Design a protein around this ligand. Structure first.
Ligand SMILES: O=C(O)C[C@H](NC(=O)c1ncnc2[nH]cnc12)c1ccc(Br)cc1
Length: 167
């Protein structure tokens, strides 16, 4: 039993809700919140910009030190950093950005990072400003993630389409 509330169950291990991941994280304080990161951990917009804003830019400060030490992530890769006031940890995961020409096959590799964590609050990878089809992102999630994932979908219209079209 966990604290996540109001989710629709899609499969044994995947759950979905129309919610602002920022507000959801502040309420649940999950062990892991997933950020829709880029390789430079520049949290300018989309989910990343919103999460970072909610940390009063502390996420960005921590991320800049991480990059200065380690260099950029790989597309499809991840790193674990602090969750600040939102969660114990933030798993920064880089899905491919279609608006940069990146291989959509890397979306499966991106979701594989979730399997290193028993329970996660997460957005749909590569959705939104990353330009991929969110219906496809959900399919890859369900077919790749084996740990317990609670998906927050900000847009109500998109949430209803995701549910109504789910196989
Ligand atoms: O809707 C989505 O979940 C995907 C993307 N948004 C985000 O990734 C996002 N951004 C900020 N806070 C969030 N909390 C949870 N997801 C959040 C998006 C896609 C299509 C349309 Br249309 C409008 C937005």
């Amino acid at each position: 039993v966990n604290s996540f509330s109001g989710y629709l169950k899609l499969t044994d291990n995947v759950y979905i809700k129309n919610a602002d991941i920022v507000e959801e994280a502040k309420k649940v304080k999950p062990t892991v919140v997933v950020n829709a990161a880029n390789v430079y951990l520049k949290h300018g917009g989309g989910v990343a910009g919103a999460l970072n804003k909610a940390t009063n830019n502390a996420m960005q400060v921590e991320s800049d030190d991480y990059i200065a030490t380690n260099g950029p992530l790989k597309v499809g890769g991840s790193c674990v950093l602090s969750g600040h006031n939102l969660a114990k940890h933030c798993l920064h995961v880089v899905g491919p950005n279609v608006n940069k020409g990146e291989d959509i096959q890397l979306l499966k590799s991106a979701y594989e990072n979730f399997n290193q964590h028993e329970v996660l609050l997460a957005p749909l990878l590569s959705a939104g400003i990353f330009g991929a089809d969110p219906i496809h992102s959900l399919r890859v999630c369900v077919d790749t993630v084996r740990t317990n994932v609670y998906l927050a979908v900000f847009d109500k219209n998109l949430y209803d389409k995701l549910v109504s079209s789910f196989l």
